Amino acid sequence: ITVAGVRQNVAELLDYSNNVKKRNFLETVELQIGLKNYDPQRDKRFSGTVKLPTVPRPNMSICILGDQHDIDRAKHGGIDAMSADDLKKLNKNKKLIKKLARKYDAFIASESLIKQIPRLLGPGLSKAGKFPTPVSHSDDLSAKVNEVKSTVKFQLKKVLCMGVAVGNVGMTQEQLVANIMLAINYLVSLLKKGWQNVGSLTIKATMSPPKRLY
Amino acid sequence: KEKQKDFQKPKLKVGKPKQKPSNFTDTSFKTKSIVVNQQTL
Amino acid sequence: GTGKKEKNRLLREGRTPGDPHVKGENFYRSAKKIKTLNILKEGKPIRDSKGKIVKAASFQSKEVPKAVI
């Protein structure tokens, strides 16, 4: 797949998203990948994370589930947070845990509380695939939120189809292109046959016609 | 494994009841009745 | 008749080449049957040209074992 073709594909994608037809919100540039010659169940389900150089979804909300010191750091940094008292007041209600999982796309928990998160919130976060990322009391929480925002996840499931968010319309062309190669190269590196198992590639915004890389 | 000792030491197996000693005598027996299937002459 | 060959018979039975094969094994004879029917064939020694025994018969050894307890 030619890189000039990549840059021109994202060129008409940004052109259509920003000039021809613009929605009322910030559309998200996303990559959809098919798979072939690969077993979903009898083989390994590959899992991996890679940080994009630029934040793909700046509107994503991240909750903080930590100690009082981390709550003070979060309210200093302007990040919403919840406490172990709040988790106890939820009282292991599946509906409330589902509402929290739907409301917050990502969670960051302190090292002292991450070993009690599956005790307090049951299996809800693991079911939603939103198990929190540990943070120590010495690490910078703003930086932690930065790689949590910049990271994407590549897990196999029961089907041979995947979809990831590689940026938004609002960022510029070259860093969009950089996000695209890091995502594609990381996926090819995770794939055990590399390019031989890749079915097809597709890039689009939230509401845009598809552009086929492959 | 081809060695044949005069006496074989029993091997303890965990999660199973202990075997009876070698000098234990078992007096339980079952009996079956022999029947001749012929009518009166 | 390729299908009546013993190789094809063992492949259709499932027994893999490399497994032990007793001499004389066919469709009618299994290994247990050969071991049973060779009992009626045992009882002969192996001799040289001059008539002396060079390999003993079955249960006819000539060796004195070490009988210790």
Partner: protein, 427 residues
């Protein structure tokens, strides 16, 4: 019931013959045969009717998958299970599902749902039928994986290190343990495991035999281990059974090892490991009891290493000086497991060469709860860039992920360079 046996099997065979001659339909034949199958007292009649039903399904789905017929029969079996839980008539549907699954005629998630209803039942025979369906298919999956694999001094030390690196690569990309297609095809595995554990294992009023409770426990623990579920009361339930006096305690320990995984907290596994250490490895304990306990502890530490404290780990590793070979090998297995995983708890005497070299040079990092691999770049991408720079320098004499797309030959070269770097680090 009242006909002669030979006449009645002749009537069944003649109905199957008329189906073969296409006089009657498969649905009509099956609706004739199935109530007689579930209600007949004759064992030979039931066996032949079951054989004819299996043959009819095989002949129908041989040329093409008959989705309508499969759906109707699956619905009929599901209704048979749903009508009466306490009845023993569901074992026929269980046996039919096993036979069609092993013949690979049915591969949909609907047989898995039917056998899920079989597991969630009151009758012990249909419960263990569903449990055997979800469990004993692991052997069939292993056979299928074997078929797929069939289809697919210093120099000696370097070769041994390369073999170890190849074994590590096989562990990285090998089929996962405790894996089965039906187990993956179960919808709501957490809900299924919770219902099974609350229905059969928790209930003291259940009069199930110990082997059947162990089958249900094997199902629950394999579900939890495979799908990474979090079922906290199961670990507290294991506490009574973690005793050497318990029958099939080896099966219980294997179940607990299957139940443990990475996302399980160390807070719940550690009392179990402490209890196994107290009851199993001690001064008055037998050698076989100590070896079994240390093997179970090694398996639990394999699934989750953070359960154990450093003092307990050093105490258990010091059992390698024991005169019993089994206890010695179990302690050495635990020591080697923590050597690759987390050598910092291990003593400086017992860490080994590679562990001490890694800890001194700073490559080895502490393993913590919840940590996930977060490689910002591809593995070996720096080595691939160095190789590309060397090639450019050679061409002149005669960033990689940022600009250039990954060629497959370049990816193979990067994998070879990563393997060479791993071999050099091992050497």
């Amino acid at each position: 019931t009242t006909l002669d046996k030979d006449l009645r099997e002749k009537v069944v065979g003649s109905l199957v013959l008329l189906r073969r001659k296409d006089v009657i339909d498969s649905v009509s034949l099956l609706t004739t045969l199935f109530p007689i199958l579930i209600s007949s007292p004759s064992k030979s009649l039931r066996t032949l009717i079951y054989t004819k039903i299996i043959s009819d399904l095989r002949e129908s789905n041989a040329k093409a998958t008959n989705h309508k017929l499969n759906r109707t029969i699956q619905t009929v079996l599901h209704n048979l299970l749903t009508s009466d839980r306490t009845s023993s008539k569901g074992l026929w549907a269980c046996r039919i599902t096993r036979e069609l699954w092993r013949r690979q005629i049915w591969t949909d998630a609907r047989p898995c749902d039917v056998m899920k209803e079989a597991c969630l039942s009151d009758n012990e025979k249909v419960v263990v039928g569903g449990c055997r369906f979800f469990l004993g298919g692991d052997k069939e999956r292993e056979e299928l994986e074997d078929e797929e694999s069939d289809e697919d001094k210093r120099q000696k030390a370097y070769e041994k290190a390369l073999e170890k690196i190849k074994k590590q690569e096989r562990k990285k990309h090998a089929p996962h343990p405790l894996n089965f297609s039906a187990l993956h095809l179960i919808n709501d595995p957490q809900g299924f495991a919770e219902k099974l554990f609350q229905k059969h294992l928790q209930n003291l009023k259940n009069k199930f035999t110990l082997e059947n409770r162990l089958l249900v426990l094997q199902l629950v623990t394999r579900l939890v281990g495979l799908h990474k579920l979090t079922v906290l009361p199961l670990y507290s339930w294991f506490v009574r059974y973690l005793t050497p006096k318990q029958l099939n305690v080896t099966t219980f320990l294997a179940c607990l090892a299957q139940a443990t995984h990475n996302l399980v907290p160390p807070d719940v596994i550690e009392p179990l490991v402490v209890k196994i250490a107290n009851e199993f490895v001690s001064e008055a304990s037998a050698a076989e009891v100590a070896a079994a306990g240390l093997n179970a502890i090694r398996e639990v530490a394999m699934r989750q290493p953070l359960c154990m404290s450093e003092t307990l780990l050093q105490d258990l590793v010091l059992y390698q000086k024991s005169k019993d070979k089994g206890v010695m090998m179990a302690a050495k297995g635990l020591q080697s497991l923590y050597r690759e995983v987390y050598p910092e708890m291990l003593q400086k005497k017992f860490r080994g060469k590679e562990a001490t070299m890694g800890l001194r040079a700073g490559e080895i990092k502490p393993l913590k709860f919840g940590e996930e691999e977060a490689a910002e770049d591809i593995e070996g991408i720096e080595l691939l860039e160095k190789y590309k720079e060397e090639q450019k320098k050679k061409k002149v004499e005669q960033k990689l992920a940022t600009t250039t797309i990954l060629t497959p030959a370049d990816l193979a070269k990067l994998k070879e360079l990563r393997q060479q770097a791993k071999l050099d680090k091992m050497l």
